[PDB]
Design a binder for this molecule. Structure first.
Ligand SMILES: Nc1ncnc2c1ncn2[C@@H]1O[C@H](CSCC[C@H](N)C(=O)O)[C@@H](O)[C@H]1O
Ligand SMILES: [Ca+2]
Length: 213
């Protein structure tokens, strides 16, 4: 039900979450240590577990209520741990092969995003990968209205309950998005040697940075 609603609200959910899973699987070993930052109910972690049965997952979020859903999702999984922490708090030491995030980092001020990317690189192994599945701003107000129309078109085509879309729009008023190429450049500024946009559907994009390759 919850997973079905996320697909209704998020254009190209399968392409964008699937691209995050595929780029991690091509970048890290079967036995990778992975941090899911702002894991919420653990949706991105779950997609990774499906592909990587032998990976160690650490799910981190500031919300105990969201992580209770992650605890239920991963009830019988002996290779999943949960950490309660704000993005702004000290990150877990690691090292990690991958740090992943979906629809969470846009809740930080821009300066805090730039600093977070730098702090993430510090806990990555050499060659390690950072992946973000993210809500991104259009480069102009005119294109932002077109991004919004395309988002609405997906939500309508997906037969989304009107009250859930209204609730979704209200939550997005608190978001601090920026365009995908600005935050990809912030990965270069943070000292990632390669950064790329893997996949994109207007307002939603999957991008990654590599710590040495
Ligand atoms: N400053 C912050 N520090 C940590 N978690 C934060 C945060 N601001 C927002 N979050 C978390 O970010 C999540 C956004 S919803 C996305 C959840 C999950 N990654 C998914 O893909 O479905 C929520 O779980 C919320 O509690
Ligand atoms: Ca949000």
């Amino acid at each position: 039900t919850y997973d079905a609603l996320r697909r209704q609200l998020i254009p190209s959910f399968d392409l964008l979450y699937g691209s995050a899973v595929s780029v991690v699987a091509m970048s890290v070993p079967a036995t990778a240590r992975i941090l899911d930052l702002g894991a919420g109910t653990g949706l991105l972690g779950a997609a990774l577990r499906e592909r990587l049965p032998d990976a160690e997952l650490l799910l981190q979020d500031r919300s105990q209520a969201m992580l209770e859903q992650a605890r239920q999702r991963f009830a019988d999984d002996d290779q999943v741990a949960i950490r309660v922490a704000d993005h702004l708090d000290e990150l877990p030491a690691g090292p990690f092969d991958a740090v992943v995030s979906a629809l969470s980092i846009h809740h930080l001020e821009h300066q805090d995003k730039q600093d977070l990317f730098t702090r993430i690189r510090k806990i990555l192994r050499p060659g390690g990968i950072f992946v973000n599945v993210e809500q991104v701003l259009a480069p102009t107000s005119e294109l932002e209205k077109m991004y919004d129309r395309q988002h609405e078109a997906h939500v309508l085509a997906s037969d989304t309950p009107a009250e859930e879309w209204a609730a979704g729009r209200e939550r997005m008023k608190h978001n601090i998005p920026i365009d995908v190429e600005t935050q990809i450049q912030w990965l270069r500024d943070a000292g990632f040697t390669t950064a790329d946009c893997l996949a994109k559907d207007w307002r939603f994009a999957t991008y990654a940075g590599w710590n040495g390759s």
